[PDB]
Structure formats: C-alpha cells, structure tokens
Amino acid sequence: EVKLQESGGGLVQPGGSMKLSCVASGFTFNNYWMSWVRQSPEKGLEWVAEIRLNSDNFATHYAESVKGKFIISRDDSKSRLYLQMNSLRAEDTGIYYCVLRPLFYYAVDYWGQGTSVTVSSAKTTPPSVYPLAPGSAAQTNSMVTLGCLVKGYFPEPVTVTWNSGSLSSGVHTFPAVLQSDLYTLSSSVTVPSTWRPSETVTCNVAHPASSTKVDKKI
Amino acid sequence: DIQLTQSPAFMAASPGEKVTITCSVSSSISSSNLHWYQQKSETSPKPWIYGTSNLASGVPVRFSGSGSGTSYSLTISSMEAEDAATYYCQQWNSYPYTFGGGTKLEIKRADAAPTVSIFPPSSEQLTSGGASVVCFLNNFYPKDINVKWKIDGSERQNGVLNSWTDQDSKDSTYSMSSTLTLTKDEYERHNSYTCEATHKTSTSPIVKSFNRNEC
C-alpha cells in the first residue's frame, strides 16, 4: 500500500538551485529507507541519493557525481522527503523518481511518477498550436486523419488531449524534437469514415509555463 | 563502480513464444538483492520482480525469475502483447546501487503498409510567418523505414524533422511524422508537393500529394 507524489520540477539556468519533494502517504513504517533515482536518455536510470531510517535519525549516502551537489533530507514529522540540488549542470537534467522501501524482511519498494528538471541556459517560450484539417481529400479507405502541429515552446513538459480527452481511439501523439533550443511535436486522430460535422473535434493543449490553447478543424 | 549488463539489447517475440533476458553482476552479490523493473513507454519504472524470484503485486504468473551468483535471468512463459516493455535489473547489495542497460522487448507482427497523409500548411500559421507541409504516416510495421519529401522532382530535404512512435498497444504498429518547414517565399515558389514513402511492403512506393486546394 502507498501514495507518493513528488512536486517541484521545472527548469533552471545552469548553476540554479532546486528542491524536489514528495510526501509519503499510508506509511508510518517504523523503519524504511528512501532515495532518489533519475532517468534521462543520455544515462538511463541512476541511483542519485538516499537518506536512511533503520532507526538512527539520519545516515545519508551519495555517489561519484552528485555529492557536494545535493543533499537528501526528510522529516517524518513533516511526512515529506526533500531533495535540494545545487550547482546544477546539463548532465543532471532528467526525471527524478522518488522511491521508498521499507525494511520488512520482505516485500518490495515503491515508486512514484517523477517530474522533469531541465538545466538549460535558454528561456521559456509558449507553443504555437495549429490545426491540421485535410487539404482537398483524405482518401486511404473510409475514415479521416486530422492533427495538430505544435511548433516552438521550450521547457519540455507538455500535454496534448483530443477533445477534452474524451476520444482516444486512434490518437498518436509523437515524441517531440528539438532544433534550435525549441521543440515541435504533433499528434493525430483518425476518426470515422464520414468526414463528420468536424464541428465537434477540438485539439486541446497544455503547457505549464503559462499556456492552454485549443482548436478546431476546416 | 559496480556493474550489471543485459544480454541482449533488443529482442523480437511472436505472440506465444518464451523469452529470457539474462542479467549479470561484476562481483558475486546475492540473489536476494537483485530487483527487476519493467518500464512501458510514456511512464515510470514499474517494480516487477523482487528477490530473485518474487513477483510484485500484479505481475502476471506467466513470468519467471531465477539465478544465483553472477547470472540472473527473467523468463516469460507465453510472450503476449503487454510484455512489450523495456525491462531493467538492479543491485541493492552495496552502494552504489547500479542498474542494467535494460533489455527492450517488442512484439512481432505481420508486415503492414502504412496510411500516409499530407496536410498542407495551416491558415493560422502562414499569415504568422513560416509554413510547413506536414506528412503523417500511420500504422506501418516494421520500423525499418525511410522517407523523402520531393517538391517538383528535386527532393528538397531541408527542414525535414522525422519523429517516430513506440509500438501501439491495440494494433502494435509504429507510426511516424515528418515536417518540412519553409520560409513562405520558398512556399508560393512551388506546387507539386509530394510525400513518397518507402517501406518493405509494396515495391511501388506510396505518394499522397497536394497541388492546390487552398489557392
């Protein structure tokens, strides 16, 4: 049993400081251990830190390239587990997973879901969605393809639903790209055979650094 | 540094096969501190196996783990389509806790021709500034594919941003996008805008294209 929710992610000019968090629910497990693991495409997964509660208040342990830089801390009274990282660099960009395991003889540890941290020198920029109705004829059998192009936004976390997330059947969002400290990504829905009174179809969009566009087809 | 490595990197499994990705330490640790994680595209490491043989809450029982010494393996009785993740091993013996390169499985299917699509620029965008002819290419299989955008013969490959998809879950096919992106002066500047697509399944390419429906 568990519920781990980590907050605090974002993006920092390099050198910037932060303070990831995650708060434990369900637990009051006399004796556990907790730690932060991180994953970016460059490195795959890596155990970064770990405070430790066998019953001695605090014992910590870090690694090859994190010590000096971050410090695990957490107080049960507070229910939370804080992780301040200083002197950040490119290398450290990734998703930080917050995983806690209890020292029962046996069972398994738990994990949460993460948050992006982006060390970049650049600056935020909102997205420019665009609709993608068809052209002059979508033909490959009876059904149609519509889509959304999302050109030019910057910190990486983003989310693209199709019509308030109500219609999934054949959505294909695509892994974003980067050419010039800017991303462009686009999705696609193939609805039914009848070009419909497209009137309903709206491509909603979410972007944490201040936006939420929306859209329509021709 | 303490090292686990996974034999092998990528696999290919027909539904109903028996898979076994091995994992192996650099120094003899003990069975009972080698955990196995499963991660499915678009989400976070999902505790799969704890102990060297314990399954976690939910792990289907067609899955099997075992080892002792330096070589631990994982085996799936009857590969099915939701095993298509990337699995990784992990060491919680001595700090530092290290992990495997992670083995990527994927589920085998019958070759299938994609559903090409080519939407031209969007009203909005053009009269903002730049303008890009976006061609989707959906539901193909396998992912060993290549593509080009030729406008009036001379393939004009300069802005082409090809982006792919990890396997479907319903159908289990790849799908990809690519964007030709141009300064509008280069845009009025031509007409035959074609997206030819070449993939193992039809020695006569696919070529959805647009001349002019707009202006």
Coordinates of C-alpha atoms in Angstrom, one line a residue:
Chain A
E1 CA 0.0 0.0 0.0
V2 CA 1.3 3.5 -0.9
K3 CA 0.8 7.0 -2.5
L4 CA 4.0 9.0 -3.4
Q5 CA 3.5 12.4 -5.1
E6 CA 6.6 14.5 -5.9
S7 CA 6.4 18.2 -6.6
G8 CA 8.8 20.9 -7.6
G9 CA 10.2 20.1 -11.0
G10 CA 10.9 22.8 -13.7
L11 CA 13.9 24.3 -15.4
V12 CA 16.8 26.4 -14.1
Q13 CA 19.5 28.5 -15.7
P14 CA 22.6 26.2 -15.0
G15 CA 24.0 26.8 -11.6
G16 CA 20.5 27.2 -10.3
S17 CA 19.2 25.6 -7.1
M18 CA 16.0 23.5 -6.6
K19 CA 14.1 21.4 -4.0
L20 CA 12.2 18.3 -5.3
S21 CA 9.9 16.9 -2.9
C22 CA 7.5 14.0 -2.4
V23 CA 5.2 13.3 0.6
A24 CA 4.5 9.8 1.9
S25 CA 1.0 8.5 2.4
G26 CA -0.1 5.2 4.0
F27 CA 3.4 4.8 5.6
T28 CA 4.3 5.3 9.2
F29 CA 6.6 2.4 8.7
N30 CA 8.5 2.4 11.7
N31 CA 11.7 1.6 9.7
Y32 CA 12.2 2.3 5.9
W33 CA 14.8 4.0 3.5
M34 CA 14.1 6.4 0.8
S35 CA 16.1 7.6 -2.1
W36 CA 16.1 9.5 -5.4
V37 CA 16.7 7.7 -8.7
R38 CA 16.8 9.7 -12.0
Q39 CA 16.4 8.9 -15.7
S40 CA 17.5 10.9 -18.8
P41 CA 18.0 9.4 -22.3
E42 CA 21.8 10.0 -22.0
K43 CA 22.2 7.8 -18.9
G44 CA 19.2 5.6 -18.5
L45 CA 18.5 5.2 -14.7
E46 CA 20.9 6.1 -11.9
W47 CA 20.6 5.9 -8.1
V48 CA 21.4 9.5 -7.2
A49 CA 20.9 9.8 -3.4
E50 CA 19.3 8.1 -0.3
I51 CA 18.7 9.1 3.3
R52 CA 18.2 6.1 5.6
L53 CA 16.0 5.4 8.6
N54 CA 16.7 1.9 10.0
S55 CA 16.1 3.9 13.3
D56 CA 19.3 6.1 13.5
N57 CA 17.8 9.5 12.7
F58 CA 19.8 10.3 9.5
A59 CA 22.5 8.5 7.6
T60 CA 22.9 9.5 4.0
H61 CA 25.0 8.2 1.1
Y62 CA 25.6 9.8 -2.4
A63 CA 27.7 8.9 -5.5
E64 CA 30.5 9.5 -8.0
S65 CA 28.8 12.7 -9.4
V66 CA 26.1 14.1 -7.1
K67 CA 27.8 14.5 -3.7
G68 CA 28.9 18.1 -3.0
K69 CA 25.9 18.9 -5.1
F70 CA 22.7 17.7 -3.5
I71 CA 21.6 16.7 0.0
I72 CA 18.8 14.3 0.9
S73 CA 16.7 15.4 3.9
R74 CA 13.2 14.3 5.2
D75 CA 11.4 14.5 8.4
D76 CA 8.7 12.0 9.3
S77 CA 7.0 14.7 11.4
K78 CA 6.7 16.6 8.1
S79 CA 5.8 13.5 6.2
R80 CA 7.9 14.8 3.4
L81 CA 11.2 13.9 1.8
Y82 CA 13.1 17.0 0.4
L83 CA 15.9 17.0 -2.1
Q84 CA 17.9 20.2 -2.7
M85 CA 20.3 20.2 -5.6
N86 CA 22.9 22.9 -6.0
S87 CA 25.4 23.9 -8.7
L88 CA 23.4 22.1 -11.4
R89 CA 24.7 21.3 -14.8
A90 CA 23.5 19.9 -18.2
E91 CA 24.3 16.4 -17.2
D92 CA 21.8 16.5 -14.3
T93 CA 18.7 17.0 -16.5
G94 CA 16.2 14.2 -16.2
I95 CA 13.2 12.8 -14.4
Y96 CA 13.5 12.3 -10.7
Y97 CA 11.8 9.2 -9.3
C98 CA 11.1 9.1 -5.6
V99 CA 11.1 5.6 -4.3
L100 CA 10.7 4.4 -0.7
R101 CA 11.2 0.8 0.5
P102 CA 10.5 -0.5 4.0
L103 CA 12.9 -2.8 5.8
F104 CA 10.3 -5.6 6.5
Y105 CA 12.1 -8.8 5.9
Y106 CA 10.4 -9.0 2.6
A107 CA 8.1 -7.1 0.3
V108 CA 9.1 -4.7 -2.4
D109 CA 9.8 -1.0 -2.6
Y110 CA 7.5 1.5 -4.1
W111 CA 8.0 4.2 -6.7
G112 CA 6.1 7.4 -7.6
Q113 CA 5.9 9.0 -11.0
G114 CA 8.5 11.8 -11.3
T115 CA 8.8 15.4 -12.7
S116 CA 11.2 16.9 -15.3
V117 CA 14.1 19.0 -14.3
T118 CA 15.7 20.9 -17.2
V119 CA 19.1 22.6 -16.9
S120 CA 19.3 24.9 -19.8
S121 CA 20.8 28.2 -20.4
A122 CA 17.9 29.4 -22.6
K123 CA 14.4 30.9 -21.8
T124 CA 10.8 29.7 -21.8
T125 CA 8.5 30.2 -24.9
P126 CA 4.9 29.2 -25.3
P127 CA 3.6 26.9 -28.0
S128 CA 2.0 27.9 -31.3
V129 CA -0.6 25.1 -32.0
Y130 CA -2.0 24.9 -35.5
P131 CA -4.9 22.8 -36.8
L132 CA -4.5 20.2 -39.5
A133 CA -7.7 19.6 -41.2
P134 CA -7.2 17.8 -44.5
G135 CA -6.2 19.7 -47.7
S136 CA -8.7 18.6 -50.5
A137 CA -9.2 14.8 -50.0
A138 CA -8.3 12.2 -47.3
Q139 CA -8.7 9.0 -49.2
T140 CA -7.0 5.8 -47.9
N141 CA -10.2 3.9 -47.3
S142 CA -13.3 5.1 -45.4
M143 CA -12.0 7.2 -42.4
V144 CA -10.0 10.5 -41.9
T145 CA -6.9 12.0 -40.5
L146 CA -6.7 15.3 -38.7
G147 CA -3.9 16.5 -36.5
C148 CA -2.2 19.3 -34.6
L149 CA 1.3 20.7 -35.1
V150 CA 2.9 22.3 -32.0
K151 CA 5.8 24.5 -33.0
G152 CA 8.0 26.3 -30.7
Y153 CA 7.8 26.0 -26.9
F154 CA 10.5 25.3 -24.5
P155 CA 10.7 23.7 -21.2
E156 CA 9.9 20.1 -22.1
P157 CA 7.0 19.1 -20.1
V158 CA 3.8 19.2 -22.4
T159 CA 0.4 17.5 -22.8
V160 CA -1.9 17.1 -25.8
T161 CA -5.5 15.7 -25.4
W162 CA -8.1 15.2 -28.2
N163 CA -11.4 16.9 -27.3
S164 CA -11.2 17.1 -23.6
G165 CA -9.6 13.7 -23.6
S166 CA -12.9 12.0 -24.4
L167 CA -11.7 10.4 -27.6
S168 CA -8.7 8.1 -27.5
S169 CA -9.4 5.6 -30.3
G170 CA -6.5 6.3 -32.7
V171 CA -4.8 9.2 -31.2
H172 CA -1.0 9.2 -31.8
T173 CA 0.9 11.8 -30.0
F174 CA 4.6 11.8 -31.1
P175 CA 7.8 12.2 -29.2
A176 CA 8.9 15.9 -29.5
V177 CA 12.1 17.0 -31.3
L178 CA 14.5 19.9 -30.9
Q179 CA 16.1 22.1 -33.4
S180 CA 17.4 25.4 -32.1
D181 CA 16.6 25.3 -28.4
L182 CA 12.8 24.9 -29.4
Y183 CA 10.5 22.0 -29.8
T184 CA 8.0 21.0 -32.3
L185 CA 5.7 18.0 -31.8
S186 CA 2.4 16.9 -33.2
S187 CA -0.3 14.4 -32.8
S188 CA -3.1 12.7 -34.8
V189 CA -6.5 11.3 -34.6
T190 CA -8.2 9.1 -37.3
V191 CA -12.0 9.4 -36.7
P192 CA -14.8 7.7 -38.7
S193 CA -15.3 7.2 -42.4
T194 CA -17.8 10.0 -42.7
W195 CA -15.9 13.3 -42.6
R196 CA -18.1 14.4 -39.8
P197 CA -19.6 17.7 -38.9
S198 CA -15.9 18.0 -37.9
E199 CA -17.7 20.7 -35.6
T200 CA -17.2 18.6 -32.6
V201 CA -13.4 17.8 -32.9
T202 CA -11.2 20.1 -30.7
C203 CA -7.5 19.6 -30.1
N204 CA -6.8 20.8 -26.5
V205 CA -3.3 21.6 -25.3
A206 CA -1.5 22.1 -22.0
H207 CA 1.9 23.8 -21.3
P208 CA 3.0 24.5 -17.7
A209 CA 5.0 27.6 -18.5
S210 CA 1.6 29.5 -18.7
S211 CA -0.5 28.3 -21.6
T212 CA -3.6 26.2 -22.8
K213 CA -4.6 26.7 -26.4
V214 CA -7.3 24.7 -28.0
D215 CA -8.5 24.1 -31.6
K216 CA -10.9 23.4 -34.4
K217 CA -10.9 21.9 -38.0
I218 CA -11.9 23.3 -41.6
Chain B
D1 CA 31.6 1.3 -9.9
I2 CA 29.6 -2.0 -9.6
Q3 CA 28.3 -3.4 -13.0
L4 CA 25.3 -5.3 -14.2
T5 CA 24.8 -5.8 -18.0
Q6 CA 21.9 -7.3 -20.0
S7 CA 22.1 -9.9 -22.7
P8 CA 20.6 -8.8 -25.0
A9 CA 19.7 -5.3 -26.0
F10 CA 16.7 -5.8 -28.3
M11 CA 14.5 -8.8 -28.9
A12 CA 11.7 -9.8 -31.1
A13 CA 8.9 -12.1 -29.9
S14 CA 6.0 -13.8 -31.7
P15 CA 2.9 -13.9 -29.5
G16 CA 3.1 -17.1 -27.6
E17 CA 6.9 -17.5 -27.5
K18 CA 9.1 -17.9 -24.4
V19 CA 11.5 -15.1 -23.7
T20 CA 14.6 -14.9 -21.4
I21 CA 16.7 -11.9 -20.9
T22 CA 19.6 -12.6 -18.6
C23 CA 21.3 -10.1 -16.2
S24 CA 24.7 -10.4 -14.6
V25 CA 26.9 -8.7 -11.9
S26 CA 30.5 -7.8 -12.0
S27 CA 31.2 -9.2 -8.5
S28 CA 29.2 -12.0 -6.9
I29 CA 26.3 -10.4 -5.0
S30 CA 23.4 -12.4 -3.6
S31 CA 20.3 -13.5 -5.4
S32 CA 18.1 -11.8 -2.8
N33 CA 19.0 -8.2 -3.6
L34 CA 18.6 -8.2 -7.4
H35 CA 15.3 -6.5 -8.2
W36 CA 13.8 -6.4 -11.7
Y37 CA 11.9 -3.4 -13.0
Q38 CA 9.6 -3.0 -16.1
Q39 CA 9.1 0.3 -17.8
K40 CA 6.4 0.9 -20.5
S41 CA 6.9 3.9 -22.9
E42 CA 5.4 7.2 -21.6
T43 CA 5.7 6.1 -17.9
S44 CA 8.0 5.2 -14.9
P45 CA 9.8 2.1 -13.7
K46 CA 7.3 -0.4 -12.5
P47 CA 8.6 -2.8 -9.8
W48 CA 8.3 -6.1 -11.5
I49 CA 10.4 -8.7 -9.6
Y50 CA 11.8 -8.5 -6.1
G51 CA 14.1 -11.1 -4.5
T52 CA 15.4 -13.0 -7.5
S53 CA 12.2 -15.0 -7.8
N54 CA 9.5 -12.9 -6.1
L55 CA 6.9 -11.2 -8.4
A56 CA 5.4 -7.9 -7.4
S57 CA 1.7 -7.2 -6.7
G58 CA 0.1 -7.8 -10.1
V59 CA 2.9 -9.3 -12.2
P60 CA 1.1 -12.0 -14.3
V61 CA 2.2 -15.5 -13.3
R62 CA 3.5 -16.5 -16.7
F63 CA 6.6 -14.5 -15.8
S64 CA 9.6 -16.2 -14.1
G65 CA 12.8 -15.1 -12.4
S66 CA 15.8 -17.1 -11.1
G67 CA 19.6 -17.1 -10.6
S68 CA 22.3 -17.4 -8.1
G69 CA 25.8 -16.0 -8.3
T70 CA 26.6 -13.7 -11.2
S71 CA 23.8 -14.6 -13.7
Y72 CA 20.1 -13.8 -13.1
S73 CA 17.6 -14.2 -15.8
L74 CA 14.0 -13.4 -16.5
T75 CA 11.7 -15.6 -18.5
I76 CA 8.2 -15.1 -19.9
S77 CA 6.2 -18.3 -20.5
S78 CA 4.0 -17.2 -23.3
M79 CA 5.0 -13.8 -24.6
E80 CA 1.9 -11.7 -25.0
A81 CA 1.5 -8.1 -26.2
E82 CA 1.6 -6.2 -23.0
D83 CA 5.0 -7.5 -22.2
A84 CA 6.4 -5.2 -24.9
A85 CA 8.2 -3.1 -22.3
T86 CA 11.9 -2.4 -21.6
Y87 CA 13.0 -4.3 -18.6
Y88 CA 15.9 -3.3 -16.4
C89 CA 17.7 -5.1 -13.4
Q90 CA 19.0 -3.5 -10.2
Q91 CA 21.5 -4.0 -7.5
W92 CA 20.7 -3.0 -3.8
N93 CA 23.6 -5.0 -2.3
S94 CA 26.3 -2.4 -1.7
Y95 CA 26.3 1.3 -2.5
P96 CA 26.2 2.4 -5.1
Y97 CA 23.1 0.7 -6.3
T98 CA 23.6 0.2 -10.1
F99 CA 21.3 -0.9 -12.9
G100 CA 21.3 -2.8 -16.1
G101 CA 21.4 -1.2 -19.6
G102 CA 17.8 -2.6 -19.7
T103 CA 16.6 -5.1 -22.3
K104 CA 13.9 -3.9 -24.8
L105 CA 11.4 -6.4 -25.9
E106 CA 8.9 -5.9 -28.6
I107 CA 6.1 -7.8 -30.1
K108 CA 6.3 -9.5 -33.5
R109 CA 3.6 -8.9 -36.2
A110 CA 2.7 -9.3 -39.9
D111 CA 4.2 -6.7 -42.3
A112 CA 1.8 -3.9 -42.9
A113 CA 1.6 -1.0 -45.3
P114 CA 1.1 2.4 -43.6
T115 CA -1.6 5.0 -44.1
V116 CA 0.3 8.1 -45.5
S117 CA -1.3 11.5 -45.1
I118 CA -0.2 15.0 -46.1
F119 CA -1.9 18.0 -44.7
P120 CA -0.7 21.3 -46.2
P121 CA 0.2 24.4 -44.0
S122 CA -2.5 25.8 -41.7
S123 CA -4.4 29.1 -42.3
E124 CA -3.3 30.3 -38.9
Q125 CA 0.4 29.7 -39.3
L126 CA 1.1 31.0 -42.8
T127 CA 0.0 34.5 -42.0
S128 CA 2.0 34.4 -38.9
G129 CA 5.3 33.8 -40.8
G130 CA 6.8 30.5 -41.8
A131 CA 4.9 27.5 -43.2
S132 CA 5.3 23.7 -43.1
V133 CA 3.8 20.8 -45.2
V134 CA 3.2 18.1 -42.6
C135 CA 3.0 14.5 -43.6
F136 CA 1.8 11.8 -41.2
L137 CA 2.5 8.1 -42.0
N138 CA 0.5 5.8 -39.8
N139 CA 0.3 2.2 -38.7
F140 CA 3.2 0.6 -40.5
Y141 CA 5.2 -2.4 -39.5
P142 CA 8.2 -3.0 -39.1
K143 CA 10.0 0.3 -38.1
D144 CA 12.9 -0.3 -40.6
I145 CA 11.5 2.6 -42.8
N146 CA 12.8 5.6 -44.7
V147 CA 11.2 8.7 -46.3
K148 CA 11.7 11.8 -48.5
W149 CA 9.8 14.9 -49.5
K150 CA 10.3 15.9 -53.1
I151 CA 8.6 19.1 -54.4
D152 CA 8.7 19.1 -58.1
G153 CA 11.2 16.3 -58.6
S154 CA 14.3 17.7 -56.7
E155 CA 13.8 16.1 -53.4
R156 CA 14.1 19.2 -51.2
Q157 CA 15.3 17.8 -47.8
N158 CA 16.0 20.9 -45.7
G159 CA 13.9 21.1 -42.6
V160 CA 12.5 17.6 -42.6
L161 CA 12.0 16.7 -38.9
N162 CA 11.2 12.9 -38.8
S163 CA 9.6 11.9 -35.4
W164 CA 8.5 8.3 -34.6
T165 CA 6.3 6.3 -32.2
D166 CA 6.9 3.4 -29.9
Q167 CA 4.6 0.4 -30.6
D168 CA 0.8 0.6 -30.4
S169 CA -1.0 -1.5 -27.8
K170 CA -4.2 -2.2 -29.6
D171 CA -2.7 -3.0 -33.1
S172 CA 1.0 -2.9 -32.3
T173 CA 2.4 -0.9 -35.2
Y174 CA 4.6 2.1 -35.5
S175 CA 3.5 5.4 -36.9
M176 CA 5.6 8.5 -37.8
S177 CA 5.6 12.1 -38.6
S178 CA 8.0 14.3 -40.5
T179 CA 7.9 18.1 -41.1
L180 CA 9.2 20.1 -44.0
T181 CA 9.4 23.6 -42.8
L182 CA 9.9 26.6 -45.0
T183 CA 10.1 30.3 -45.1
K184 CA 7.0 31.4 -47.1
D185 CA 8.9 32.8 -50.0
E186 CA 10.1 29.2 -50.7
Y187 CA 6.4 28.2 -50.3
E188 CA 4.4 30.1 -53.0
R189 CA 7.6 29.3 -55.0
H190 CA 6.4 25.7 -55.9
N191 CA 3.3 23.4 -56.4
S192 CA 3.9 19.6 -56.6
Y193 CA 4.2 18.9 -53.0
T194 CA 4.6 15.1 -52.6
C195 CA 5.4 12.8 -49.7
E196 CA 6.8 9.4 -51.2
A197 CA 7.1 6.7 -48.6
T198 CA 9.2 3.5 -49.0
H199 CA 8.9 0.6 -46.8
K200 CA 9.5 -3.2 -47.4
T201 CA 5.7 -3.7 -48.2
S202 CA 5.0 -2.5 -51.8
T203 CA 7.9 -2.1 -54.2
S204 CA 5.7 0.6 -55.8
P205 CA 6.1 3.4 -53.2
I206 CA 3.3 5.4 -51.5
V207 CA 2.9 9.1 -52.6
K208 CA 0.0 11.2 -51.2
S209 CA 0.5 14.7 -52.5
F210 CA -1.1 18.1 -52.9
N211 CA -1.0 20.6 -55.8
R212 CA -3.5 23.3 -54.7
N213 CA -7.0 23.1 -52.9
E214 CA -6.4 26.3 -51.0
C215 CA -5.5 29.0 -53.5

